[PDB]
Design an enzyme around this catalytic site. Structure first.
Site, PDB file in Angstrom:
ATOM      1  N   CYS A 110       0.840  -1.192   0.000  1.00 29.03           N
ATOM      2  CA  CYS A 110       0.000   0.000   0.000  1.00 29.03           C
ATOM      3  C   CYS A 110       0.876   1.243   0.000  1.00 29.03           C
ATOM      4  O   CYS A 110       1.636   1.482   0.943  1.00 29.03           O
ATOM      5  CB  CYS A 110      -0.966   0.013   1.192  1.00 29.03           C
ATOM      6  SG  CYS A 110      -1.929   1.545   1.318  1.00 29.03           S
ATOM      7  N   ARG A 113       0.110   4.597   2.907  1.00 35.41           N
ATOM      8  CA  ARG A 113       0.196   4.327   4.333  1.00 35.41           C
ATOM      9  C   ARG A 113       0.595   5.522   5.182  1.00 35.41           C
ATOM     10  O   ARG A 113       0.500   5.419   6.412  1.00 35.41           O
ATOM     11  CB  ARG A 113       1.175   3.189   4.582  1.00 35.41           C
ATOM     12  CG  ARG A 113       0.560   1.844   4.355  1.00 35.41           C
ATOM     13  CD  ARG A 113       1.600   0.805   4.623  1.00 35.41           C
ATOM     14  NE  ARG A 113       2.540   0.673   3.504  1.00 35.41           N
ATOM     15  CZ  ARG A 113       3.655  -0.051   3.568  1.00 35.41           C
ATOM     16  NH1 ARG A 113       3.974  -0.671   4.706  1.00 35.41           N
ATOM     17  NH2 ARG A 113       4.447  -0.153   2.509  1.00 35.41           N
ATOM     18  N   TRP A 282      -9.032   6.439  -0.502  1.00 41.25           N
ATOM     19  CA  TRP A 282      -9.353   7.187  -1.700  1.00 41.25           C
ATOM     20  C   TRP A 282      -8.379   6.768  -2.798  1.00 41.25           C
ATOM     21  O   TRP A 282      -7.345   6.136  -2.550  1.00 41.25           O
ATOM     22  CB  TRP A 282      -9.311   8.701  -1.452  1.00 41.25           C
ATOM     23  CG  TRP A 282      -8.047   9.157  -0.865  1.00 41.25           C
ATOM     24  CD1 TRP A 282      -6.860   9.349  -1.529  1.00 41.25           C
ATOM     25  CD2 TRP A 282      -7.798   9.483   0.503  1.00 41.25           C
ATOM     26  NE1 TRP A 282      -5.904   9.779  -0.654  1.00 41.25           N
ATOM     27  CE2 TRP A 282      -6.447   9.873   0.598  1.00 41.25           C
ATOM     28  CE3 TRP A 282      -8.589   9.501   1.659  1.00 41.25           C
ATOM     29  CZ2 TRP A 282      -5.865  10.268   1.805  1.00 41.25           C
ATOM     30  CZ3 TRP A 282      -8.012   9.891   2.857  1.00 41.25           C
ATOM     31  CH2 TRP A 282      -6.665  10.270   2.921  1.00 41.25           C
ATOM     32  N   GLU A 287      -4.750   4.089 -10.604  1.00 40.66           N
ATOM     33  CA  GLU A 287      -5.563   2.896 -10.430  1.00 40.66           C
ATOM     34  C   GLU A 287      -6.696   2.881 -11.442  1.00 40.66           C
ATOM     35  O   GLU A 287      -6.956   1.856 -12.082  1.00 40.66           O
ATOM     36  CB  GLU A 287      -6.112   2.823  -9.009  1.00 40.66           C
ATOM     37  CG  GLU A 287      -5.074   2.749  -7.917  1.00 40.66           C
ATOM     38  CD  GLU A 287      -5.729   2.701  -6.553  1.00 40.66           C
ATOM     39  OE1 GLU A 287      -6.178   1.604  -6.176  1.00 40.66           O
ATOM     40  OE2 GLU A 287      -5.821   3.757  -5.879  1.00 40.66           O
TER      41      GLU A 287
HETATM   42  C1  HEM Z   1      -6.149   6.560   2.208  1.00 35.51           C
HETATM   43  C2  HEM Z   1      -5.797   6.460   0.926  1.00 35.51           C
HETATM   44  C3  HEM Z   1      -5.186   5.185   0.280  1.00 35.51           C
HETATM   45  C4  HEM Z   1      -4.485   5.211  -0.863  1.00 35.51           C
HETATM   46  C5  HEM Z   1      -4.143   6.460  -1.705  1.00 35.51           C
HETATM   47  C6  HEM Z   1      -4.085   3.862  -1.171  1.00 35.51           C
HETATM   48  C7  HEM Z   1      -3.352   3.479  -2.271  1.00 35.51           C
HETATM   49  C8  HEM Z   1      -3.203   2.166  -2.643  1.00 35.51           C
HETATM   50  C9  HEM Z   1      -2.885   1.671  -3.964  1.00 35.51           C
HETATM   51  C10 HEM Z   1      -2.651   2.545  -5.215  1.00 35.51           C
HETATM   52  C11 HEM Z   1      -2.816   0.336  -3.883  1.00 35.51           C
HETATM   53  C12 HEM Z   1      -2.542  -0.656  -5.020  1.00 35.51           C
HETATM   54  C13 HEM Z   1      -3.944  -1.062  -5.457  1.00 35.51           C
HETATM   55  C14 HEM Z   1      -3.899  -1.906  -6.700  1.00 35.51           C
HETATM   56  O1  HEM Z   1      -2.961  -1.719  -7.506  1.00 35.51           O
HETATM   57  O2  HEM Z   1      -4.813  -2.749  -6.884  1.00 35.51           O
HETATM   58  C15 HEM Z   1      -3.107  -0.065  -2.524  1.00 35.51           C
HETATM   59  C16 HEM Z   1      -3.121  -1.356  -2.049  1.00 35.51           C
HETATM   60  C17 HEM Z   1      -3.473  -1.766  -0.779  1.00 35.51           C
HETATM   61  N1  HEM Z   1      -4.032  -0.962   0.206  1.00 35.51           N
HETATM   62 FE1  HEM Z   1      -3.922   1.091   0.212  1.00 35.51          FE
HETATM   63  N2  HEM Z   1      -4.568   3.015  -0.178  1.00 35.51           N
HETATM   64  C18 HEM Z   1      -5.259   3.799   0.728  1.00 35.51           C
HETATM   65  C19 HEM Z   1      -5.891   3.324   1.853  1.00 35.51           C
HETATM   66  C20 HEM Z   1      -5.836   2.057   2.389  1.00 35.51           C
HETATM   67  C21 HEM Z   1      -6.514   1.616   3.593  1.00 35.51           C
HETATM   68  C22 HEM Z   1      -7.416   2.543   4.435  1.00 35.51           C
HETATM   69  C23 HEM Z   1      -6.219   0.311   3.774  1.00 35.51           C
HETATM   70  C24 HEM Z   1      -6.634  -0.656   4.900  1.00 35.51           C
HETATM   71  C25 HEM Z   1      -7.088  -0.217   6.078  1.00 35.51           C
HETATM   72  C26 HEM Z   1      -5.339  -0.094   2.696  1.00 35.51           C
HETATM   73  C27 HEM Z   1      -4.803  -1.341   2.509  1.00 35.51           C
HETATM   74  C28 HEM Z   1      -4.264  -1.762   1.317  1.00 35.51           C
HETATM   75  C29 HEM Z   1      -3.831  -3.105   0.994  1.00 35.51           C
HETATM   76  C30 HEM Z   1      -3.880  -4.323   1.928  1.00 35.51           C
HETATM   77  C31 HEM Z   1      -3.356  -3.102  -0.255  1.00 35.51           C
HETATM   78  C32 HEM Z   1      -2.783  -4.321  -0.997  1.00 35.51           C
HETATM   79  C33 HEM Z   1      -3.897  -5.132  -1.650  1.00 35.51           C
HETATM   80  C34 HEM Z   1      -3.295  -6.381  -2.266  1.00 35.51           C
HETATM   81  O3  HEM Z   1      -2.229  -6.849  -1.794  1.00 35.51           O
HETATM   82  O4  HEM Z   1      -3.893  -6.922  -3.227  1.00 35.51           O
HETATM   83  N3  HEM Z   1      -5.136   0.989   1.882  1.00 35.51           N
HETATM   84  N4  HEM Z   1      -3.334   1.083  -1.796  1.00 35.51           N
HETATM   85  C1  LIG Z   2      -7.426  -7.758  -2.960  1.00 33.68           C
HETATM   86  N1  LIG Z   2      -6.566  -6.888  -3.787  1.00 33.68           N
HETATM   87  C2  LIG Z   2      -7.280  -5.623  -4.048  1.00 33.68           C
HETATM   88  C3  LIG Z   2      -6.296  -4.539  -4.456  1.00 33.68           C
HETATM   89  C4  LIG Z   2      -7.045  -3.241  -4.690  1.00 33.68           C
HETATM   90  C5  LIG Z   2      -7.941  -3.110  -5.751  1.00 33.68           C
HETATM   91  C6  LIG Z   2      -8.625  -1.915  -5.949  1.00 33.68           C
HETATM   92  F1  LIG Z   2      -9.503  -1.718  -6.943  1.00 33.68           F
HETATM   93  C7  LIG Z   2      -8.398  -0.869  -5.106  1.00 33.68           C
HETATM   94  F2  LIG Z   2      -9.044   0.279  -5.331  1.00 33.68           F
HETATM   95  C8  LIG Z   2      -7.512  -0.986  -4.067  1.00 33.68           C
HETATM   96  C9  LIG Z   2      -7.390   0.191  -3.200  1.00 33.68           C
HETATM   97  C10 LIG Z   2      -7.778   0.038  -1.887  1.00 33.68           C
HETATM   98  C11 LIG Z   2      -7.729   1.121  -1.042  1.00 33.68           C
HETATM   99  C12 LIG Z   2      -8.135   0.952   0.400  1.00 33.68           C
HETATM  100  C13 LIG Z   2      -7.326   2.343  -1.531  1.00 33.68           C
HETATM  101  C14 LIG Z   2      -6.972   2.447  -2.869  1.00 33.68           C
HETATM  102  N2  LIG Z   2      -6.565   3.627  -3.374  1.00 33.68           N
HETATM  103  N3  LIG Z   2      -7.035   1.379  -3.681  1.00 33.68           N
HETATM  104  C15 LIG Z   2      -6.834  -2.172  -3.827  1.00 33.68           C
END
Ligand code: HEM
Ligand SMILES: CNCCc1cc(F)c(F)c(-c2cc(C)cc(N)n2)c1
Ligand code: HEM
Ligand SMILES: CNCCc1cc(F)c(F)c(-c2cc(C)cc(N)n2)c1
Ligand SMILES: C[C@H](O)[C@H](O)[C@H]1CNc2nc(N)[nH]c(=O)c2N1
Ligand SMILES: C[C@H](O)[C@H](O)[C@H]1CNc2nc(N)[nH]c(=O)c2N1
Ligand SMILES: [Zn+2]
Lengths: 414, 418
Positions: A110, A113, A282, A287
């Site tokens: 992520c 973070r 958000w 994405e």
């Molecule tokens: C607040 C703004 C946030 C932004 C800008 C953000 C951004 C991102 C992005 C760009 C990804 C890659 C997604 C993809 O390529 O499919 C990601 C993955 C991820 N986010 Fe964040 N995220 C946010 C919030 C959060 C929150 C609130 C959580 C959990 C409480 C979280 C947990 C995760 C996890 C676990 C992944 C990895 C998913 C996977 O391994 O398939 N994120 N995030």
């Molecule tokens: C199980 N793997 C799902 C990965 C995934 C797919 C997706 F379409 C998303 F949008 C986000 C994601 C999630 C959060 C909390 C914020 C953000 N900016 N993106 C993450």
């Protein structure tokens, strides 16, 4: 022992000690790296649960400068009693909030973070039915969406018990668009969601058969068969995509939803498994603009956009795909910003992630980070994360993958 | 067995080649070091003159592999070769590769190079045996011949020139240049940098060695050549051998006024070629560019030529906020220009779309015939437009096969001058 990581752009060197606390496997071996494998590698026994619980409770009490306190020791005593007598235990609310936040803080994939500690945790562990889940999820959506001023949030449903009474959101995200395979092999809507759309239709959903049908929620409580619920449309904030320079872009008819809300992951805290834990933040614009719109397997709009741009598409070295991709992502960001819906561009997001990473190294001794995921899917090396060495390791609490429910669920009706 | 999936095509490939890996990746089951530039210092033999029981096992392994590769395992020639290598090590603490083994080893080091997207070409490698070389002058001659052969008036041909292997470590052959052809970099009085900032230190060594810098933005650096452990010596590559491409844009007539150019021949000269325990510390190798190497990294890294600002201005983009994606927009135009310019001058170049597609094809070939293809996703995925290339969606397994190209210390960090 220490491990050094270097930024090859700034030559800043950070020293990782936190990796010594890691627990679970990366998938790599000493002779093979599986860092680009997407998913590398029934319920915990009493003996397995004790040490997992202890380590979590120890780290919770260490985090609040109460390690070894009387309250720390009584909590361990109490947790052990419940494991002994019930084969599981219940988290205090403080521990649930801490655990959810740290699973985010520990999410090596992520980039967002820097925001980890500002997470709104909705405790839904009293939920017993799919109707209750629907109500909890609507409240989540409404709170998180906040009329476009998005706020991070997670809703945590009851933990796994015997593995036969799982709570699951069958949706991969709370808000996604349907996909419909046409008889001619073309797809309408989102091709990624064709299978899930079929499941919904089979369960009784009457699909509009449009390009951007918000899917119904498919919610499973207590191991029962999942149930369909339509998210009230006024809670689904969407953004019509237009371009600040190309007036014709709006004619593509594109939109996206504002709320990225992942609902198919598993939240592990102290050995407890929260199989239904939808969380939302958000969007980073790539994405939508890079993956959702331009993956060949997704909406795949590069050809159409490049056509309307009059690009030379007869040869790859014209970089017509690259040119169209940038404009699409400009449109995504412009559109969200114009509608005052929170979004972050990949430059700002990776910049903040580097600041976050360095801060984490300073205060925590490291920051597990998955370079393969942290680097944005376009313009990689012009973002600072590209030049940043990262160490990937698995800390707990953590978010984990779990099998799709339709592959494991055993149906009960008729 | 390990499986890799392509998430765009759902093709799954099954890897057994990794069972032959020799060096640690740096990862463990608890930590992944996949984005560390030099994750591991695991070498197959200690730093200097190995004892017999340290070198012979590595030689045997390589000879075994070579003779297996030609369906001659255990043959008369194979067993004789073992006996021969044993005697050489017995009497000289080292051994000498046959020409065929040298060629096999060099091609296989390329084939095994997990970070190289160009490996579909691996068996088309011209190997220049320069093991008879004894002086920096001879190294210059060999390098000039390499550059001229490799350049081939813009129809680039992959080549490697292999100078004498390391002996005791005090008699190393080294090309002190990181690449045969690079541009100088100069610290300006005000504090900015003229030319290539990556080469400021190397440029200062050259100047300090007597090089007279023209102090322009694209001054082809001299070769700094070290033979048999002696002090390195400066040589000016004949400019007619240095093919260069003026960069212009097929649409923006102002682009040429930026005064950009680049050289045609990417020729890495600071790596170590390791074959059968032998270490070839000077082994310049060259192929042809993927456009992004120039247009993205060389031109647009902040610590390189850093030209996004200049280009975006001329493009009249809104550069006030990152979200206008003005950097991304200029980035594409720059890379369009680089490709267009090389192609207009009939200088071999490949765009990242074609190269990555070729690599997927190469991966499949290797899984089919070899049972695997070590590949470093972090390096293979191009530094722009990642996910619109097929390799972004391709899972890869990274492991270290021998023969191989290895990093080595910069010689000015280790050389005791005379
Ligand atoms: C607040 C703004 C946030 C932004 C800008 C953000 C951004 C991102 C992005 C760009 C990804 C890659 C997604 C993809 O390529 O499919 C990601 C993955 C991820 N986010 Fe964040 N995220 C946010 C919030 C959060 C929150 C609130 C959580 C959990 C409480 C979280 C947990 C995760 C996890 C676990 C992944 C990895 C998913 C996977 O391994 O398939 N994120 N995030
Ligand atoms: C199980 N793997 C799902 C990965 C995934 C797919 C997706 F379409 C998303 F949008 C986000 C994601 C999630 C959060 C909390 C914020 C953000 N900016 N993106 C993450
Ligand atoms: C023939 C056309 C070739 C193309 C298009 C090509 C392409 C590339 C590219 C784009 C990189 C990444 C470069 C960087 O980011 O710095 C690379 C790395 C590499 N190439 Fe190739 N290459 C070619 C030929 C060769 C040859 C002939 C050899 C050796 C005989 C070779 C060995 C390597 C090695 C070892 C690396 C990794 C370098 C490192 O780890 O620092 N390549 N190649
Ligand atoms: C030691 N790490 C250097 C990596 C590197 C730097 C560089 F500047 C290059 F140009 C190439 C390279 C090499 C070859 C043979 C072909 C090609 N297209 N690029 C490789
Ligand atoms: C094979 C490769 O690991 C896979 O395509 C990854 C690459 N990096 C990614 N990075 C992000 N943020 N999201 C992804 O889905 C992927 N996919
Ligand atoms: C830190 C990170 O590993 C480093 O920036 C790498 C990333 N991927 C790369 N990929 C290529 N082809 N070349 C590089 O120099 C790098 N640099
Ligand atoms: Zn790894």
């Amino acid at each position: 022992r220490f491990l050094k990581v270097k930024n090859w752009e700034t030559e800043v060197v950070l020293t990782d000690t936190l990796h010594l606390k890691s627990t679970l496997e990366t998938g790599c071996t000493e002779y093979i790296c599986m860092g680009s494998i997407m998913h590398p590698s029934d319920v915990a026994t009493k003996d397995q649960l004790f040490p997992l619980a202890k380590e979590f409770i120890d780290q919770y009490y260490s985090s609040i400068k109460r390690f070894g306190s009387k309250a720390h020791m009584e909590r361990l005593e109490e947790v052990n009693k419940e494991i002994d007598t019930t084969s599981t235990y219940q988290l205090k609310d403080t521990e649930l909030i801490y655990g959810a936040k740290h699973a985010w803080r520990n999410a090596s994939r992520c980039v967002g973070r820097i925001q980890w500690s500002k997470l709104q945790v909705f405790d839904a562990r009293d939920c017993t039915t799919a109707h209750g889940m629907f109500n909890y999820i609507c409240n989540h959506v409404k709170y998180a969406t906040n009329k476009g001023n998005l706020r991070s949030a997670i809703t945590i449903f009851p933990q796994r018990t015997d593995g036969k009474h799982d709570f699951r959101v069958w949706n991969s995200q709370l808000i996604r668009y349907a996909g419909y395979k046409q008889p001619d092999g073309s797809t309408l809507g989102d091709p990624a969601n064709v299978q899930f759309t079929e499941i919904c239709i089979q369960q009784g959903w009457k699909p509009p058969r449009g390009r951007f049908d918000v899917l119904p929620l498919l919610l499973q409580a207590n191991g029962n068969d999942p149930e369909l619920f339509q998210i009230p449309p006024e809670l689904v904030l969407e953004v019509p995509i237009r371009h600040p320079k190309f007036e014709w872009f709006k004619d593509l008819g594109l939109k996206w939803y504002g709320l990225p809300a992942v609902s198919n992951m598993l939240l592990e805290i102290g050995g407890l498994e929260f199989s239904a834990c939808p969380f939302s933040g958000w969007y980073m614009g790539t994405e939508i603009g890079v993956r959702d719109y331009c993956d060949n397997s997704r909406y795949n709009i590069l050809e159409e956009v490049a056509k309307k741009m009059n690009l030379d598409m007869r040869k790859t070295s014209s970089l017509w795909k690259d040119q169209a991709l940038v404009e699409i992502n400009i449109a995504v960001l412009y559109s969200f910003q114009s509608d005052k819906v929170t979004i972050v561009d990949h430059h700002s997001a990776t910049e903040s992630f580097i600041k976050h990473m360095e801060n984490e190294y300073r205060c925590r001794g490291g920051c597990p980070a998955d370079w393969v995921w942290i680097v944005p899917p376009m313009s990689g090396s012009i973002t600072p994360v590209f030049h940043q060495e990262m160490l990937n390791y698995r800390l707990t609490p953590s978010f984990e993958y779990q099998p799709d429910p339709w592959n494991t669920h055993v149906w009960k009706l008729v």
